[PDB]
Write an enzyme that holds these catalytic residues in place. Structure first.
Site, PDB file in Angstrom:
ATOM      1  N   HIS A 121      47.950 122.910 -28.339  1.00  0.00           N
ATOM      2  CA  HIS A 121      47.928 122.265 -29.650  1.00  0.00           C
ATOM      3  C   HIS A 121      48.674 120.941 -29.644  1.00  0.00           C
ATOM      4  O   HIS A 121      48.433 120.107 -30.524  1.00  0.00           O
ATOM      5  CB  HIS A 121      48.545 123.170 -30.712  1.00  0.00           C
ATOM      6  CG  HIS A 121      47.550 124.007 -31.453  1.00  0.00           C
ATOM      7  ND1 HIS A 121      46.424 123.473 -32.036  1.00  0.00           N
ATOM      8  CD2 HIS A 121      47.520 125.333 -31.721  1.00  0.00           C
ATOM      9  CE1 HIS A 121      45.732 124.436 -32.615  1.00  0.00           C
ATOM     10  NE2 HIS A 121      46.377 125.574 -32.441  1.00  0.00           N
TER      11      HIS A 121
ATOM     12  N   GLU B 292      41.522 124.124 -33.633  1.00  0.00           N
ATOM     13  CA  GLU B 292      41.599 125.336 -32.825  1.00  0.00           C
ATOM     14  C   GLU B 292      40.488 125.389 -31.797  1.00  0.00           C
ATOM     15  O   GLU B 292      40.689 125.874 -30.690  1.00  0.00           O
ATOM     16  CB  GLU B 292      41.571 126.588 -33.710  1.00  0.00           C
ATOM     17  CG  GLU B 292      42.710 126.673 -34.713  1.00  0.00           C
ATOM     18  CD  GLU B 292      44.068 126.784 -34.061  1.00  0.00           C
ATOM     19  OE1 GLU B 292      44.132 127.094 -32.856  1.00  0.00           O
ATOM     20  OE2 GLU B 292      45.089 126.561 -34.747  1.00  0.00           O
TER      21      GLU B 292
ATOM     22  N   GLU C  35      51.880 125.984 -33.859  1.00  0.00           N
ATOM     23  CA  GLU C  35      52.057 124.839 -32.974  1.00  0.00           C
ATOM     24  C   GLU C  35      52.919 123.870 -33.745  1.00  0.00           C
ATOM     25  O   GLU C  35      52.485 122.766 -34.065  1.00  0.00           O
ATOM     26  CB  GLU C  35      50.716 124.196 -32.651  1.00  0.00           C
ATOM     27  CG  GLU C  35      49.971 123.642 -33.867  1.00  0.00           C
ATOM     28  CD  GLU C  35      49.036 124.654 -34.510  1.00  0.00           C
ATOM     29  OE1 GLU C  35      49.416 125.853 -34.546  1.00  0.00           O
ATOM     30  OE2 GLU C  35      47.936 124.257 -34.982  1.00  0.00           O
TER      31      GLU C  35
ATOM     32  N   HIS D  20      48.106 128.489 -25.666  1.00  0.00           N
ATOM     33  CA  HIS D  20      47.421 128.017 -26.865  1.00  0.00           C
ATOM     34  C   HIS D  20      48.315 127.075 -27.659  1.00  0.00           C
ATOM     35  O   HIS D  20      47.908 125.955 -28.011  1.00  0.00           O
ATOM     36  CB  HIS D  20      46.981 129.194 -27.730  1.00  0.00           C
ATOM     37  CG  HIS D  20      46.212 128.797 -28.952  1.00  0.00           C
ATOM     38  ND1 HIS D  20      44.839 128.851 -29.013  1.00  0.00           N
ATOM     39  CD2 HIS D  20      46.625 128.351 -30.160  1.00  0.00           C
ATOM     40  CE1 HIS D  20      44.442 128.450 -30.206  1.00  0.00           C
ATOM     41  NE2 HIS D  20      45.505 128.137 -30.919  1.00  0.00           N
ATOM     42  N   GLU D  21      49.541 127.517 -27.944  1.00  0.00           N
ATOM     43  CA  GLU D  21      50.478 126.672 -28.690  1.00  0.00           C
ATOM     44  C   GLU D  21      50.855 125.406 -27.908  1.00  0.00           C
ATOM     45  O   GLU D  21      51.055 124.341 -28.489  1.00  0.00           O
ATOM     46  CB  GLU D  21      51.722 127.471 -29.063  1.00  0.00           C
ATOM     47  CG  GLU D  21      51.436 128.788 -29.783  1.00  0.00           C
ATOM     48  CD  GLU D  21      50.604 128.607 -31.036  1.00  0.00           C
ATOM     49  OE1 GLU D  21      50.541 127.469 -31.552  1.00  0.00           O
ATOM     50  OE2 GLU D  21      50.007 129.600 -31.495  1.00  0.00           O
TER      51      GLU D  21
ATOM     52  N   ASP E 138      44.345 130.195 -47.109  1.00  0.00           N
ATOM     53  CA  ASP E 138      44.853 131.465 -46.578  1.00  0.00           C
ATOM     54  C   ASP E 138      43.768 132.547 -46.551  1.00  0.00           C
ATOM     55  O   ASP E 138      43.755 133.408 -45.657  1.00  0.00           O
ATOM     56  CB  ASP E 138      46.038 131.950 -47.400  1.00  0.00           C
ATOM     57  CG  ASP E 138      47.264 131.081 -47.230  1.00  0.00           C
ATOM     58  OD1 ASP E 138      47.477 130.569 -46.111  1.00  0.00           O
ATOM     59  OD2 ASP E 138      48.012 130.914 -48.221  1.00  0.00           O
TER      60      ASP E 138
ATOM     61  N   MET F  89      49.319 139.279 -39.043  1.00  0.00           N
ATOM     62  CA  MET F  89      48.173 139.631 -39.875  1.00  0.00           C
ATOM     63  C   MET F  89      46.935 139.923 -39.044  1.00  0.00           C
ATOM     64  O   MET F  89      45.993 140.528 -39.550  1.00  0.00           O
ATOM     65  CB  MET F  89      47.868 138.521 -40.874  1.00  0.00           C
ATOM     66  CG  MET F  89      48.939 138.358 -41.945  1.00  0.00           C
ATOM     67  SD  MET F  89      48.391 137.376 -43.358  1.00  0.00           S
ATOM     68  CE  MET F  89      47.997 135.820 -42.565  1.00  0.00           C
TER      69      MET F  89
ATOM     70  N   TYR G  30      38.265 129.385 -34.150  1.00  0.00           N
ATOM     71  CA  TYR G  30      38.776 129.525 -32.798  1.00  0.00           C
ATOM     72  C   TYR G  30      37.646 129.794 -31.813  1.00  0.00           C
ATOM     73  O   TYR G  30      37.494 129.069 -30.833  1.00  0.00           O
ATOM     74  CB  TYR G  30      39.804 130.653 -32.734  1.00  0.00           C
ATOM     75  CG  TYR G  30      41.078 130.388 -33.510  1.00  0.00           C
ATOM     76  CD1 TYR G  30      41.110 130.492 -34.898  1.00  0.00           C
ATOM     77  CD2 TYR G  30      42.260 130.062 -32.850  1.00  0.00           C
ATOM     78  CE1 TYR G  30      42.278 130.264 -35.606  1.00  0.00           C
ATOM     79  CE2 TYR G  30      43.431 129.829 -33.548  1.00  0.00           C
ATOM     80  CZ  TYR G  30      43.440 129.930 -34.918  1.00  0.00           C
ATOM     81  OH  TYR G  30      44.620 129.694 -35.580  1.00  0.00           O
TER      82      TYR G  30
HETATM   83  C1  LIG Z   1      48.117 129.168 -41.079  1.00  0.00           C
HETATM   84  O1  LIG Z   1      46.820 129.282 -40.568  1.00  0.00           O
HETATM   85  C2  LIG Z   1      45.871 128.518 -41.257  1.00  0.00           C
HETATM   86  C3  LIG Z   1      45.590 128.784 -42.584  1.00  0.00           C
HETATM   87  C4  LIG Z   1      44.649 128.023 -43.257  1.00  0.00           C
HETATM   88  C5  LIG Z   1      43.985 127.010 -42.643  1.00  0.00           C
HETATM   89  C6  LIG Z   1      42.921 126.109 -43.311  1.00  0.00           C
HETATM   90  C7  LIG Z   1      41.545 126.472 -42.754  1.00  0.00           C
HETATM   91  C8  LIG Z   1      40.574 125.492 -42.616  1.00  0.00           C
HETATM   92  C9  LIG Z   1      39.326 125.820 -42.112  1.00  0.00           C
HETATM   93  C10 LIG Z   1      39.049 127.127 -41.744  1.00  0.00           C
HETATM   94  C11 LIG Z   1      37.673 127.488 -41.187  1.00  0.00           C
HETATM   95  C12 LIG Z   1      36.907 126.600 -40.411  1.00  0.00           C
HETATM   96  S1  LIG Z   1      35.492 127.457 -40.044  1.00  0.00           S
HETATM   97  C13 LIG Z   1      35.876 128.890 -40.856  1.00  0.00           C
HETATM   98  N1  LIG Z   1      35.058 130.087 -40.946  1.00  0.00           N
HETATM   99  N2  LIG Z   1      37.083 128.701 -41.400  1.00  0.00           N
HETATM  100  C14 LIG Z   1      40.020 128.105 -41.882  1.00  0.00           C
HETATM  101  C15 LIG Z   1      41.269 127.777 -42.387  1.00  0.00           C
HETATM  102  C16 LIG Z   1      44.268 126.746 -41.312  1.00  0.00           C
HETATM  103  C17 LIG Z   1      45.204 127.491 -40.616  1.00  0.00           C
HETATM  104 ZN   LIG Z   2      45.934 127.808 -33.116  1.00  0.00          ZN
END
Ligand SMILES: COc1ccc(Cc2ccc(-c3csc(N)n3)cc2)cc1
Ligand SMILES: [Zn+2]
Length: 607
Positions: A296, A315, A268, A292-293, A372, A561, A380
């Site tokens: 955002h 998300e 997004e 979705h995008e 990452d 991925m 989500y």
């Molecule tokens: C490029 O995409 C991204 C890569 C890193 C991130 C950071 C981030 C933060 C929280 C989470 C989270 C919340 S609850 C759960 N189980 N995981 C996951 C990632 C965001 C997007």
């Molecule tokens: Zn998203």
């Protein structure tokens, strides 16, 4: 506290503007130039500040036309190297100074993938694209790489004249490079404040096609038309988004379809959403990703998470909007379908991670975790489940949609926390606090595993997918012959995919069943990557060797991925294919996206 950023936090100072002047060198695979940060002190007597960096080279730091003293800290692995800058004048609170950082990117930037002409469609020009989420922007330029700071930015990007540079901003003209007639300088401007993770850049042989009043579609000449058709619903979706969320504040909304190795379904990025070419199913069937995008633009880009721990607000709410947009376009019954389908993914996520894994929580503690590495579908889908359960608990869609519009307006251009959201929820629904207290908050927000309560889903469109998956799973050898192409006659693409998810969950199947399925259904011939991805996962899980090359081709011919990581994992967990899987990865690691490489390596426990 944002534990992902070594730079000064918002309570000390803020970056209000970025001015970016740089040139893209495709030989050195570097970005070189200056970054002008207008920083505003947040305390009395501020004498020094600290910025994020990663694999960056700093030639000099200039303030008020004189070189000042700076310092690059020691690397903290994935967080980069802190950068302390000594200001020439101590600053009162709210005062500002501009800091011109002359820098250069490393060719190994975690934020940038370089593509040789060979790696693109045209085969005649290289290609570059960025992916700053979650904390890779520090790998492009020095900054407070945290969503708790929102800046505007301007940019002038020099690129070989025969290429095109687009950014997550409004196009502001293009003129030949006066220092070099072989290069063009494309200008950009982003008058809305964004967190630095939405900064984005692309350079290549890009063309465009207009598909809406405020919507061009960019990609290589080989996919521009395929893409403009696939995403023709953009404008329709943007209007529905404006009805639910309020005015779209970013002006233009363009789409860029990137080369196959782009790591995600979409980003997004304001004014220019990136998307995987795997969406080009040719029937508009994967267009929810666009929705979705689009969504955002309100939940995430406008109201942003303060730290990455509260990422679910980004998300979670977005997905909630995405399925409403689809609900408006195709019907409430289709909204539930996708909702129920999300619950099925949430089960796959918890079953795989484990019922206790920290990353099945809704709010996570990313201290010392590579963002990452924590990324998954939990925020989500579990995020959606919480909102969808509240919608039913508080009187239905119409009512809750009203709170969503109030939520977005309340917190626009700001960065909030889960508690900020909880307090406003209670505030908007003050006349229902009794009903709010009924919710086990500590379980929804901080407990692992599936949610405490499962929402109520309409089954209308899902029944056929259950019916067919029950026949296939309970069938003995003398039932295999009755299966026939007619079994799908009335199944839509999305229903076709859910059936495979329904079956994929009860894997493995008898190898005989898998063969009879290819024989009657010819699932091999389908190009919709969502269907094909689940098909090949079922085969590889059911020990059909014949699928080993198909799965390898798909795992390597594109880089999403979502598909690549499972396929590789399933392939490595199949003894017949383990060697090929680990060999193929090694063979491809150097030409994969930096983040995709590292993660697939960790998955295969290699290097
Ligand atoms: C490029 O995409 C991204 C890569 C890193 C991130 C950071 C981030 C933060 C929280 C989470 C989270 C919340 S609850 C759960 N189980 N995981 C996951 C990632 C965001 C997007
Ligand atoms: Zn998203």
């Amino acid at each position: 506290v944002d534990t992902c950023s070594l730079a000064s936090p918002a309570s000390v100072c803020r970056t209000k503007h970025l001015h970016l002047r740089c040139s893209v060198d495709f030989t050195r695979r570097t970005l070189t130039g200056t970054a002008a940060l207008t920083v505003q002190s947040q305390e009395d007597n501020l004498r020094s500040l600290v910025l994020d960096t990663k694999d960056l080279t700093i030639e000099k730091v200039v303030i008020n036309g004189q070189e000042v003293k700076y310092a690059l800290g020691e690397r903290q692995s994935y967080k980069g190297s802190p950068m302390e800058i000594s200001l020439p004048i101590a600053l009162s609170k709210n005062q500002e100074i501009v800091i011109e950082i002359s820098f250069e990117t490393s060719p190994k930037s975690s934020a940038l993938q370089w593509l040789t002409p060979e790696q693109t469609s045209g085969k005649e020009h290289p290609y570059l694209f960025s992916q700053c989420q979650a904390i890779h922007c520090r790998a492009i330029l020095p900054c407070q790489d945290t969503p708790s700071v929102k800046l505007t930015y301007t940019a002038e990007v020099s690129v070989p004249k025969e290429l095109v540079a687009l950014m997550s901003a409004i196009r502001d003209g293009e003129t030949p490079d006066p220092e070099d007639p072989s290069r063009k300088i494309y200008k950009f401007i982003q008058k809305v404040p964004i967190p630095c993770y939405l900064i984005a850049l692309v350079v290549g042989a890009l063309e465009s096609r207009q598909i809406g009043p405020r919507t061009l579609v960019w990609s290589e000449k080989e996919q521009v038309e395929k893409s403009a058709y696939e995403f023709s619903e953009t404008e329709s979706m943007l209007k529905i988004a404006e009805d639910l969320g309020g005015p779209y504040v970013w002006g233009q909304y363009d789409l860029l379809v990137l080369p196959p190795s782009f790591p995600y379904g979409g980003m997004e990025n304001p004014c220019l959403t990136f998307v995987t070419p795997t969406l080009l199913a040719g029937d508009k069937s994967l267009s929810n990703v666009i929705a979705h995008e689009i969504s955002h633009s309100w939940t995430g880009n406008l109201v942003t998470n303060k730290t990455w721990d509260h990422f679910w607000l980004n998300e979670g709410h977005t997905v909630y909007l995405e399925r409403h947009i689809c609900g408006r376009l195709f019907g409430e019954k289709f909204r539930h379908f996708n909702a129920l389908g999300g619950w099925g993914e949430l089960q796959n996520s918890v079953k795989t991670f484990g019922e206790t894994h920290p990353f099945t929580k809704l709010v996570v503690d990313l201290t010392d975790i590579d963002p990452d590495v924590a990324y998954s579908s939990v925020p989500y889908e579990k995020g959606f489940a919480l909102l969808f359960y509240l919608e039913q608990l508080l009187g239905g869609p119409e009512i809750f949609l009203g709170f969503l519009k109030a939520y977005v307006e309340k917190f626009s251009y700001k960065s909030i926390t889960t508690d900020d959201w909880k307090d406003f929820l209670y505030s908007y629904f003050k006349d229902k606090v009794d009903v709010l207290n009924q919710v086990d908050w500590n379980a929804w927000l901080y407990s692992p595993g599936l949610p405490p309560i499962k929402p109520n889903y309409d089954m209308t469109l899902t029944n056929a997918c259950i019916a067919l998956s029950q026949r296939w799973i309970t069938a003995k050898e003398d039932d295999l012959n009755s299966f026939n192409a007619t079994d799908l006659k009335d199944l839509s693409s999305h229903q076709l995919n859910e059936f495979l998810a329904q079956t994929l969950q009860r894997a493995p199947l008898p190898l005989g069943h898998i063969k009879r399925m290819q024989e009657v259904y010819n699932f091999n011939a389908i190009n919709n990557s969502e269907i094909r991805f689940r098909w090949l996962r079922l085969c590889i899980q059911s020990k059909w060797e014949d699928a080993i090359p198909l799965a390898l081709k798909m795992a390597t011919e594109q880089g999403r991925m979502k598909f690549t990581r499972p396929l590789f994992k399933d392939l490595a967990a199949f003894d017949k294919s383990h060697d090929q899987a680990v060999r193929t990865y090694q063979e491809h690691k150097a030409s994969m996206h930096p983040v995709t490489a590292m993660l697939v390596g960790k998955d295969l426990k290699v290097d």
